Amino acid sequence: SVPSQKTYQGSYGFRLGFLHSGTAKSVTCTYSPALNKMFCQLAKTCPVQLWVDSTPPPGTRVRAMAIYKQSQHMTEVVRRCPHHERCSDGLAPPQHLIRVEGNLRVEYLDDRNTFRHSVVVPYEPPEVGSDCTTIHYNYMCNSSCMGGMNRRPILTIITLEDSSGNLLGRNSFEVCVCACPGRDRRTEEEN
Amino acid sequence: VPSQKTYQGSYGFRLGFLHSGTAKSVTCTYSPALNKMFCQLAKTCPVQLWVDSTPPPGTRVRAMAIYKQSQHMTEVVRRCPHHERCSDGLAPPQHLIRVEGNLRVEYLDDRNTFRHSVVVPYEPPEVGSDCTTIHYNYMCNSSCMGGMNRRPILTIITLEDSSGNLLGRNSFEVCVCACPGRDRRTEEEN
Amino acid sequence: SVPSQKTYQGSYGFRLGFLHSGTAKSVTCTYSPALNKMFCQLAKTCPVQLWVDSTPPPGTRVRAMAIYKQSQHMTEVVRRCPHHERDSDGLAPPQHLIRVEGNLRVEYLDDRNTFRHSVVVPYEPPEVGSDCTTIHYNYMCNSSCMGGMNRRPILTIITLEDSSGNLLGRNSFEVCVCACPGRDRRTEEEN
Amino acid sequence: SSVPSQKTYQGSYGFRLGFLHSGTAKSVTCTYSPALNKMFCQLAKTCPVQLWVDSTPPPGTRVRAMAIYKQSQHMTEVVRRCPHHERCSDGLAPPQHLIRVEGNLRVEYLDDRNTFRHSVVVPYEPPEVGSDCTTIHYNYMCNSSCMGGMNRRPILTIITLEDSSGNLLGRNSFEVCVCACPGRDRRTEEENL
Numbered sequence: 001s002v003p004s005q006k007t008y009q010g011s012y013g014f015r016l017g018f019l020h021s022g023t024a025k026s027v028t029c030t031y032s033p034a035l036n037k038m039f040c041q042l043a044k045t046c047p048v049q050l051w052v053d054s055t056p057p058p059g060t061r062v063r064a065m066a067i068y069k070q071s072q073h074m075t076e077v078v079r080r081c082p083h084h085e086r087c088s089d090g091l092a093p094p095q096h097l098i099r100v101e102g103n104l105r106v107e108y109l110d111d112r113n114t115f116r117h118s119v120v121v122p123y124e125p126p127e128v129g130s131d132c133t134t135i136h137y138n139y140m141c142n143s144s145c146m147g148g149m150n151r152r153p154i155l156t157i158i159t160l161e162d163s164s165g166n167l168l169g170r171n172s173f174e175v176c177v178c179a180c181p182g183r184d185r186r187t188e189e190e191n
Numbered sequence: 192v193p194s195q196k197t198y199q200g201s202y203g204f205r206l207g208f209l210h211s212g213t214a215k216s217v218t219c220t221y222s223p224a225l226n227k228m229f230c231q232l233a234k235t236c237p238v239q240l241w242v243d244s245t246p247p248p249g250t251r252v253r254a255m256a257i258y259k260q261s262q263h264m265t266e267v268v269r270r271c272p273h274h275e276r277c278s279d280g281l282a283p284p285q286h287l288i289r290v291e292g293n294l295r296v297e298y299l300d301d302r303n304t305f306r307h308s309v310v311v312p313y314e315p316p317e318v319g320s321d322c323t324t325i326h327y328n329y330m331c332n333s334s335c336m337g338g339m340n341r342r343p344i345l346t347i348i349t350l351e352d353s354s355g356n357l358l359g360r361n362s363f364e365v366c367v368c369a370c371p372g373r374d375r376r377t378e379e380e381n
Numbered sequence: 382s383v384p385s386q387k388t389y390q391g392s393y394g395f396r397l398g399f400l401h402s403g404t405a406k407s408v409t410c411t412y413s414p415a416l417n418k419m420f421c422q423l424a425k426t427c428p429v430q431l432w433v434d435s436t437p438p439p440g441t442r443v444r445a446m447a448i449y450k451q452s453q454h455m456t457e458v459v460r461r462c463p464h465h466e467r468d469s470d471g472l473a474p475p476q477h478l479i480r481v482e483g484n485l486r487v488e489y490l491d492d493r494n495t496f497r498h499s500v501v502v503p504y505e506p507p508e509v510g511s512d513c514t515t516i517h518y519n520y521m522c523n524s525s526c527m528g529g530m531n532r533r534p535i536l537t538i539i540t541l542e543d544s545s546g547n548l549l550g551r552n553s554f555e556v557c558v559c560a561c562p563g564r565d566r567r568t569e570e571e572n
Numbered sequence: 573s574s575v576p577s578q579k580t581y582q583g584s585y586g587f588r589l590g591f592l593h594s595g596t597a598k599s600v601t602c603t604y605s606p607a608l609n610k611m612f613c614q615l616a617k618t619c620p621v622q623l624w625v626d627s628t629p630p631p632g633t634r635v636r637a638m639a640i641y642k643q644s645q646h647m648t649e650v651v652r653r654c655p656h657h658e659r660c661s662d663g664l665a666p667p668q669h670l671i672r673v674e675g676n677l678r679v680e681y682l683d684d685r686n687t688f689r690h691s692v693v694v695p696y697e698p699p700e701v702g703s704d705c706t707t708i709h710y711n712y713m714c715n716s717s718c719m720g721g722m723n724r725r726p727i728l729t730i731i732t733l734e735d736s737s738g739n740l741l742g743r744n745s746f747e748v749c750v751c752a753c754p755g756r757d758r759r760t761e762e763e764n765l
């Protein structure tokens with residue numbers, strides 16, 4: 001029906017972090033803590049940090065899924081528009097909005113019962129002298145895409161799961177994929 | 192040795208596979224990274240046919256296994272003596288690859304190369320869908336003693352017209368194993 | 382052609398298991414994982430477990446055969462000492478080292494060409510509560526019997542075959558038949 | 573009762589346990605609480621347990637470890653790994669066994685044929701030249717929190733010294749918590765008092 005977006009830090013103290021990028025014209029990805037909202041460009045690197053209080057064990061996986069924010073649209077699967085879904089696809093299904101770049105162990109799922117799309121990578125701990133793990137996501141349509149997201153806001157849900165799929169952690173953030181993230185962030189904050 | 196050269200041809204013939212993931216319970220899962228299908232003995236292994244334009248009536252779709260390794264490549268891929276034992280329906284008992292849920296299936300023992308293949312009529316996608324799905328079954332395990340014996344194989348898929356002329360070709364590696372999800376997840380860890 | 386001792390799990394994921402019996406004076410059979418060696422008493426029950434990932438068909442058979450481990454003895458048939466051959470249960474040939482107890486469908490072979498002894502039983506799936514199938518082997522000579530094994534080490538080769546004789550899998554283990562299995566395991570491990 | 577004996581006894585060799593004074597820093601993988609007689613440790617990591625004696629036991633002496641549930645309503649339940657961790661093995665240990673010994677090739681595992689309890693045994697070796705106690709490195713192979721396993725029930729490890737013929741010589745015990753953050757979990761449990 002609808003996957004849960006309820007924040008769940010769980011046993012490992014799972015939290016998300018984001019670079020402090022600002023709102024200048026050069027910025028290709030910028031997070032608003034006031035809005036809990038990422039502003040990023042089509043197909044460009046979006047860094048997401050995983051912060052934990054304890055290290056989950058090897059075989060832990062990190063999954064990302066998008067849903068529609070508005071209750072009227074929430075049961076609709078978030079997918080790429082017909083224009084963009086036309087098969088640079090590498091290892092990714094052409095319909096999927098969310099890709100991970102720079103990870104050979106990436107796995108993509110079409111849920112056989114919910115038909116929802118997700119992308120999964122193995123959780124790796126931070127490098128020694130590092131405090132967080134970084135996944136580079138790419139968003140493969142614009143929020144404005146006719147016949148896809150069509151200006152409807154989306155949430156990204158990031159779940160930590162054990163090797164059997166059981167929930168260990170869940171966080172979420174709103175996403176706008178737009179041409180001018182710095183400008184769009186600064187304008188959306190000024191209201 | 193049968194040609195394994197990718198050939199989209201005149202109708203833009205491509206293969207697709209479900210995005211099944213690697214849950215322990217999955218019956219069949221394809222690794223885009225390895226171009227490799229992981230599936231269970233005698234269970235459904237869906238293969239999608241995608242075309243840019245519709246092949247003419249009487250087009251056929253053939254599947255044939257060969258060994259991947261150079262020094263096993265002339266050897267005909269067939270079931271182990273244990274599994275070859277009769278028990279089979281429309282399929283020859285020695286054939287590794289079957290098609291299920293197609294009453295028009297045809298099986299060939301090449302009288303000259305002795306290779307096994309399985310053929311069906313090409314049907315366009317059903318109402319609503321963008322691809323044609325063929326349910327293959329692999330009737331030995333990759334680890335069968337006296338059969339494949341842990342040796343890797345490729346499946347070659349060919350689109351042919353009514354007269355047996357080549358229209359398209361593609362291929363993928365196959366592992367027939369107890370737990371496809373685990374085995375894909377493990378093989379991808381390198 | 383000395384029989385093959387090469388391990389094959391095969392289509393059914395065939396391996397061997399043994400009870401974790403310890404080395405107390407009272408123990409009648411104990412297996413050493415570090416030595417891959419079973420220590421047992423003359424004529425006493427020696428449980429050997431069959432573990433499979435997938436159930437082979439009814440009609441599947443399980444064969445045991447002993448061979449000398451040392452290369453210069455490998456071509457000699459392993460058989461009971463003169464004393465011990467001269468006792469029988471009424472199914473076992475008096476020269477066979479390995480019997481199966483508590484199985485009315487046991488079959489014994491003297492190979493027409495090699496002259497090697499083996500004992501076969503039907504494969505049955507695990508009983509309810511169990512993840513493995515247990516065969517009770519009896520070894521009918523002592524390792525030290527002069528005129529039989531005469532302290533020469535031996536392997537038992539366990540083969541899983543179908544109703545038609547086709548080989549499905551193989552595994553093996555070393556055996557010592559002795560008065561005090563617990564003490565001999567403890568002593569041999571202590572190198 | 574049916575449950576095996578937990579009562580402390582130093583016996584003839586004056587047998588007792590010791591534990592390193594490791595503190596509670598975030599990096600610590602195991603830490604013992606003298607106030608709680610309780611060892612906090614991480615899944616599958618080294619857990620040093622010291623054997624202290626007044627006189628040297630004969631060669632052939634053995635040191636056995638066994639886990640029991642602490643709470644009287646669970647005491648008769650055999651302690652074993654959860655079904656998930658049973659599926660994950662060094663080839664010497666049974667996959668169901670909670671307690672392993674690391675780095676001892678003479679290790680022996682027992683499944684009791686009548687109690688069905690698990691235990692792990694090693695030979696007693698005297699202290700090396702320039703040491704005053706023998707150290708065994710235990711590994712605990714399931715979390716305290718594991719569902720279908722300990723399921724948050726506290727356990728005791730019972731350490732027995734026994735002769736070559738199985739005669740009990742001494743017995744000691746300690747509570748154990750297998751957790752993600754031993755340092756943090758020891759501090760929190762000590763501050764309720």
Ligand SMILES: *C[C@@H]1C(=O)C2CCN1CC2
Nearest residue numbers: 215216369370371373434
């Ligand atoms: C891979 C696993 C197994 O080992 C059996 C068959 C399929 N899944 C679930 C049980």
Ligand SMILES: *C[C@H]1C(=O)C2CCN1CC2
Nearest residue numbers: 143151152153176177178
């Ligand atoms: C990116 C931008 C849009 O196009 C609408 C949805 C999300 N965000 C606000 C309005």
Ligand SMILES: *C[C@H]1C(=O)C2CCN1CC2
Nearest residue numbers: 087094205206207208241
């Ligand atoms: C475009 C289409 C194809 O033809 C294959 C690659 C991606 N997509 C599904 C299968």
Ligand SMILES: *C[C@H]1C(=O)C2CCN1CC2
Nearest residue numbers: 276277278279282283284
């Ligand atoms: C087993 C054998 C038969 O008896 C007929 C069907 C299949 N195979 C060939 C002919």
Ligand SMILES: *C[C@H]1C(=O)C2CCN1CC2
Nearest residue numbers: 333341342343365366367
């Ligand atoms: C399934 C697995 C095997 O058993 C061999 C062939 C293919 N794959 C790698 C090796």
Ligand SMILES: *C[C@H]1C(=O)C2CCN1CC2
Nearest residue numbers: 524525532533534557558
């Ligand atoms: C049982 C014991 C013996 O008697 C010799 C052969 C195997 N093992 C070691 C030496």
Ligand SMILES: *C[C@H]1C(=O)C2CCN1CC2
Nearest residue numbers: 716724725726749750751
């Ligand atoms: C580690 C912790 C737990 O999870 C329960 C048992 C022992 N300790 C206290 C409660």
Ligand SMILES: [Zn+2]
Nearest residue numbers: 081084141145
């Ligand atoms: Zn788009």
Ligand SMILES: [Zn+2]
Nearest residue numbers: 271274331335
């Ligand atoms: Zn086979």
Ligand SMILES: [Zn+2]
Nearest residue numbers: 462465522526
């Ligand atoms: Zn004898």
Ligand SMILES: [Zn+2]
Nearest residue numbers: 654657714718
């Ligand atoms: Zn566990």
